[PDB]
């Protein structure tokens, strides 16, 4: 249905600039999570380190090294105790926070995959969710260190996941133009959607729970619902030839905090599929759009060791 | 700024210490490994003294060289390629005795075309425009042997030549040489090995130093 | 993990002697210490403080220009020189660790310490009661006072409460006033505005005779007060 939400009052040109200038970083930024205290965030360095950077006050307060020297991604526990190490090495490394007699200790490495860590979430303290790049996005959890659900019906590889709020489903998008609607109870796909051309270099999840958009390389998003088995809506631009590499939401869900390979980033509406504003001020491209929960900071983890929060 | 000035001190203490752990890892150069399988791999990781991929760390003449072999990757070269950016230069190891065989994944295409068809893919993407390639040429002895047994005619169609060694060497260097578009920015060092001839490390150490000679000048312009 | 003492015993008023306090267990190099001393008839003072990573130095009002204080990573020891000693410096000197970022839990583990005998701007902050009985299970509310408003920039109260057990460290309790810290039951609840400050404590335990202490971090100066005990 594209006739329904034609009759929206447009938001308008919105205009937003950057708050803090995160530097520190001498190497490539990959992923840049957020976490839930809309206060502390995490980033993932390139040579051998993993800082968790401050958002108010702009301090580091732990740059951890790690073992693998590339970290392709990272996660932020909802609690604030641990973090999840990407990479190519097959070990989600994690760290503990909050430990006695130390500033951080390594708690649990994450091995048994075959292909690369690409995206890491947290479902809650224990029970933690990975990507890896063998196509195999299993779950793991941290007091016995192993696999208790394997996740399969992907035909390439996976790089993108994403959870909800019910912490019951998550979507992931694969490199071959499909993203699986999996359920952490059965552990089986409830549906693959189809429509995109180009690979799904990372996924986002709407705030209620009802629909998600994908961020393909063929320089187009989609607004793909749970209940409804179709694309909504659609986002494409004429003048740009590169693909989105990270799609946000907002607190509200209208802003669809996407970024391109342009050395910037958008701002569309899920309603009158326009670009509303334009987020440039990187060097190199951005790889990563962590938005709080409450709307509160959009980061950005571009190539060129900057991390701007966007409001 | 009152209660919050430990908490400031305490950045800028592990702002200094990253700040260290980054020059000591520029110090050391980063290479990474490429080739089919089983090119020639343990006969240069085993000479130094040092799943996933493989990282070793070696110091030589002064100088840490930390080594990269992607060896067995699951998922596809287009993903942790496209995330390898900064790196000096790459390796490429193929055996030219793998000329004869075809390869069991299609039972169609020989095993000089698919190293030829990888050579082709790397050094045209957007990301290893300006790093270099040193190729190493492991089991020079298995290809002499090869090519006193076989006339090569066979792999190479449009080929022509008499029976020997060095003009087929020759034929390799110009071979891998002339896929890249351009040559000024994407410059190749070629050296062979076998069971002899121990102690190779020195051409790759003065291939890494005029390549980050190279890039230096570049970064000032001064190339 | 553990923090043990050693070179007390008998000094004279102006003498020498070597003191430190032995540390092993975690990472000295990220983790400032203080000296916190306890008298046995006067309430706790704070006299010096040094950065994580031998960084900036804090000092008291009474001690600047007086005492030396160094540290040594590789050797892990803390090195104190007590010079221009006085015959009213009787107190059990602490070797307590303090961590400081968003979320830290500041002096969460103290140390022990030795006894000593001998022969013969500032911010202070008054307390409400000093001895009163408590009978264990009846839902004590501790209240307390401050001589300034707790209305830092930043948006957070700086107040933390500690108790001394006789033969026990002075452990945390609670940090922030709204947070609990690590090693205590869910039973504190901490609040109040700027000025006054209130502890709830439902549930009460055995064991529960130590005396109550608070201390503020706004500025250098760290004073404890005089103490509010608590009886059977």
């Known amino acids: 249905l594209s006739q329904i939400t034609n009759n929206i009052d447009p938001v308008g040109r919105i205009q937003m600039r950057t708050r803090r200038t995160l530097r520190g970083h001498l190497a490539k930024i990959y992923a840049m999570h957020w976490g839930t205290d809309s206060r502390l965030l995490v980033s993932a360095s390139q040579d051998g380190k993993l800082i968790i950077w401050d958002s108010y006050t702009t301090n580091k307060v732990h740059a951890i090294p790690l073992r693998s020297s590339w970290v392709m991604t990272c996660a932020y526990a909802p609690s604030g105790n641990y973090v999840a190490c990407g990479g190519l090495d097959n070990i989600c490394s994690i760290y503990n926070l909050k430990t006695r007699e130390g500033n951080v200790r390594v708690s649990r490495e994450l091995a048994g995959h075959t292909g690369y860590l690409s995206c890491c979430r947290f479902l809650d303290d224990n029970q933690i969710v990975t990507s890896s790049g063998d196509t195999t996005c299993a779950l793991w959890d941290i007091e016995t260190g192993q696999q208790t659900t394997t996740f399969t019906g992907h035909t390439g590889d996976v790089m993108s996941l994403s959870l909800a709020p019910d912490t019951r489903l998550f979507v992931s998008g694969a490199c071959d133009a499909s993203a699986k609607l999996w359920d952490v109870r059965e552990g089986m796909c409830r549906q693959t959607f189809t429509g995109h051309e180009s690979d799904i270099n990372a996924i986002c999840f709407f705030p209620n729970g009802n629909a998600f958009a994908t961020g393909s390389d063929d320089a187009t998003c989609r607004l793909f619902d749970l209940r409804a088995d179709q694309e909504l809506m659609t986002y494409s631009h004429d003048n740009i030839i590169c693909g989105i590499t990270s799609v946000s939401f907002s607190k509200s869900g209208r802003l669809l905090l996407a970024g391109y390979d342009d050395f910037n980033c958008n701002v569309w509406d899920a309603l009158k599929a326009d670009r509303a504003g334009v987020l440039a001020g990187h060097d190199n491209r951005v790889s990563c759009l962590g938005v709080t929960d409450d709307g509160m900071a959009v980061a950005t983890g571009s190539w060129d060791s900057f991390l701007k929060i966007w409001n | 700024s009152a209660e919050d000035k430990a908490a400031v001190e305490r950045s800028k203490m592990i702002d200094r210490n990253l700040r260290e752990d980054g020059e000591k890892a520029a110090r050391e150069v980063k290479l990474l490994l490429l080739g089919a399988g089983e090119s020639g791999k343990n006969t240069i990781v085993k000479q130094m003294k040092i799943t996933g991929i493989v990282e070793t760390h070696f110091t030589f003449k002064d100088l840490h060289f930390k080594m990269f072999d992607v060896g067995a990757q699951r998922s596809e070269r287009k993903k942790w390629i496209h995330c390898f950016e900064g790196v000096t230069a790459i390796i490429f190891c193929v055996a030219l005795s793998d000329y004869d065989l075809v390869l069991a994944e299609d039972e169609e295409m020989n095993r000089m075309h698919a190293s030829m068809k990888l050579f082709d893919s790397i050094c045209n993407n957007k990301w290893f425009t300006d790093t270099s390639i040193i190729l190493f040429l492991n089991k020079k002895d298995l290809f002499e042997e090869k090519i006193k047994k076989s006339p090569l005619t066979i792999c190479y169609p449009e080929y022509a030549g008499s029976n020997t060694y060095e003009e087929a060497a020759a034929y390799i260097q110009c071979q891998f040489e002339d896929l890249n578009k351009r040559k000024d920015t994407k410059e190749i060092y070629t050296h062979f090995t076998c069971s002899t001839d121990t102690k190779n490390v020195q051409f790759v150490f003065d291939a890494v130093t005029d390549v980050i000679i190279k890039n230096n000048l570049k970064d000032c312009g001064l190339f | 993990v553990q923090l043990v003492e050693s070179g007390g015993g008998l000094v004279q008023p102006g003498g020498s002697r070597k003191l430190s306090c032995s540390a092993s267990?975690?990472?000295?190099?990220?983790?400032?210490m203080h000296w916190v001393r306890q008298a046995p008839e006067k309430g706790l003072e704070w006299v010096a403080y040094?950065?994580?990573?031998?960084?900036?130095?804090y000092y008291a009002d009474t001690v600047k220009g007086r005492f030396t204080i160094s540290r040594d990573d590789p050797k892990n020891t803390l090195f104190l020189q007590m010079t221009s000693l006085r015959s009213e410096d009787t107190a059990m000197y602490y070797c307590?660790?303090?961590?400081?970022?968003?979320?830290?839990?500041?002096?969460?583990?103290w140390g022990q310490g030795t006894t000593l005998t001998v022969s013969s701007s500032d911010i202070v902050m008054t307390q409400a009661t000093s001895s009163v009985p408590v009978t264990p299970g009846e839902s004590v509310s501790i209240s307390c006072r401050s001589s300034?408003?707790?209305?830092?920039?930043?948006?957070?109260?700086?107040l933390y409460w500690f108790l001394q057990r006789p033969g026990q460290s002075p452990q945390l309790l609670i940090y922030?006033?709204?947070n609990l810290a690590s090693g205590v039951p869910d039973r504190f609840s901490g609040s109040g505005s700027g000025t006054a400050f209130t502890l709830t404590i439902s549930r009460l335990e055995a064991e529960d005779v130590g005396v109550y202490y608070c201390?503020?971090?706004?500025?250098?100066?760290?004073?404890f007060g005089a103490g509010t005990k608590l009886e059977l």
């Open positions: 307590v660790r303090s961590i400081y970022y968003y979320g830290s839990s500041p002096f969460d583990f």
């Open positions: 267990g975690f990472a000295f190099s990220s983790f400032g």
């Open positions: 040094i950065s994580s990573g031998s960084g900036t130095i």
């Open positions: 300034k408003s707790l209305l830092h920039s930043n948006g957070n109260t700086y």
């Open positions: 922030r006033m709204s």
């Open positions: 201390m503020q971090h706004l500025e250098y100066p760290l004073t």
